[PDB]
């Protein structure tokens, strides 16, 4: 029943920064609060317990504070291996609820154009009476991008897509399925990728 609200939901930051994450409990949970670091595809990792005690082996740049309903995790100087999602958790009372997480993302290059790579259908897929256009996207920043597809210069479809960090840059991709007659009969097809004030469009043609 006890709600745990973190804020911000996400933030961008650079090596050396001071990061401060906030967790608010919907009621008094005393000193009974833990913080965890979670990397993608990895187990959460315990950092802080009792609101302010560093767990064994946890670097000193991590520290927590708070009591009652207002809690804080603070990273004194953000290190490279610290981009991750940080969760607060109350263990004061059942059911030991977690905060929704706060993504701490590499700032990167916020005004860079998206890098876009576009592959046409292979002769193999065309022979299987099918065909797929493959648009690959690599960005130096965390934000969502918009992808629009074009047949010649007419729009086909268009969606917003979130990117995810990679094993560094953020990645996404989009797919457009076509009949073989669709691919052969148009002069070209295009994937167009937009982030804020930058757009990159790549074009392919049956050749």
């Amino acid at each position: 029943d006890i709600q745990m609200t973190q804020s911000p939901s996400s933030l961008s930051a650079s090596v050396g920064d001071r990061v401060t994450i906030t967790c608010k409990a919907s009621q008094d949970v005393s000193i009974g609060v833990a913080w965890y670091q979670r990397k993608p595809g990895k187990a959460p990792k315990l950092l802080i317990y009792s609101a302010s005690y560093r767990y064994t082996g946890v670097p000193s740049r991590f520290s927590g504070s708070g009591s009652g309903t207002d809690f804080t995790l603070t990273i004194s100087s953000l290190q490279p291996e610290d981009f991750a999602t940080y969760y607060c958790q109350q263990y004061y009372i059942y059911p030991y609820t977690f905060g929704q997480g706060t993504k701490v993302e590499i700032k990167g290059q916020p005004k860079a154009a998206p890098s876009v790579t576009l592959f046409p259908p292979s002769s193999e897929e065309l022979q299987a009476n099918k065909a797929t256009l493959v648009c690959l996207i690599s960005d130096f920043y965390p934000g969502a991008v918009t992808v629009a597809w074009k047949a010649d210069s007419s729009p086909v479809k268009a969606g917003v897509e979130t990117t995810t960090p990679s094993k560094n840059k953020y990645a996404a991709s989009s797919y457009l399925s076509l009949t073989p007659e669709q691919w052969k009969s148009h002069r070209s097809y295009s994937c167009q990728v937009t982030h804020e004030g930058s757009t990159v469009e790549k074009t392919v043609a049956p050749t």
């Binding site: 959460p44 315990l46 958790q89 059911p95 592959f119 292979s122 493959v134």
Partner: protein
């Protein structure tokens, strides 16, 4: 020293049942309460249940009471989660975890296991070559279910310059992914490039040689 090794994930249809195992080592198994905690993209973390192996008692989160059951096998130092009446919304990565003592925050965790609940059928992937200073070539791994697939190049010998993109769910309920390797243009005549696609959920591996256009 302290290890929790899980097994048992997989695909199951709505209403089905599945049992997960947590094999423990490096501590007196019965001296600690243990837990399950699940994670789902965009749903964060949810504590599921705990068992005190000393009292034999377990406690469940409201959403799972009456349908999930904990149990333990001391002789094997192993914790189980039995899930019944699963719904699509139970799709998640399940972790076993341990309390330090009486307080319910978690010091050690399992590696995690994916449980997918869906009425959609397992389908192995269609693998298509993406024909290519340097050249980018790839494979398209198309129309598969459920996750995950893994892609390697040249049997895992080639790791530099490889980029596997996250799987994308189409509105057909099937996934597609691509993996691209960037190699010297001068390599293209003399060096063979083979993508190795492993889809454990359908017990299928597919290897595709990528040729110039």
């Amino acid at each position: 020293e302290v290890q929790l090794v899980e097994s048992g994930g997989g695909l199951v249809q709505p209403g089905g049942s599945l049992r997960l195992s947590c094999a423990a080592s490096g501590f007196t198994f019965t001296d600690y309460t243990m837990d399950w905690v699940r994670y789902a993209p965009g749903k964060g973390l949810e504590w599921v249940a705990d068992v005190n192996p000393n009292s034999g008692g377990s406690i469940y989160n409201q959403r799972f009471k009456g349908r999930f059951t904990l149990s333990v096998d001391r002789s094997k130092n192993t914790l189980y989660l039995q899930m019944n009446s699963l719904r699509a919304e139970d799709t998640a990565v399940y972790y076993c975890a341990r309390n330090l003592g009486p307080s319910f925050y978690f010091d050690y965790w399992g590696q995690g296991t994916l449980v997918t609940v869906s009425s959609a059928s397992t389908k192995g992937p269609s693998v298509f070559p993406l024909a290519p200073g340097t050249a980018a070539l790839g494979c398209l791994v198309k129309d598969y279910f459920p996750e995950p697939v893994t892609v390697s190049w040249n049997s895992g010998a080639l790791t530099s310059g490889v980029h596997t993109f996250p799987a994308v769910l189409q509105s057909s309920g099937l996934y597609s992914l691509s993996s691209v390797v960037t190699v010297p243009s001068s390599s293209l005549g003399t060096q063979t490039y083979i993508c190795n696609v492993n889809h454990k959920p359908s017990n299928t591996k597919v290897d595709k040689k990528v040729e110039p256009k």
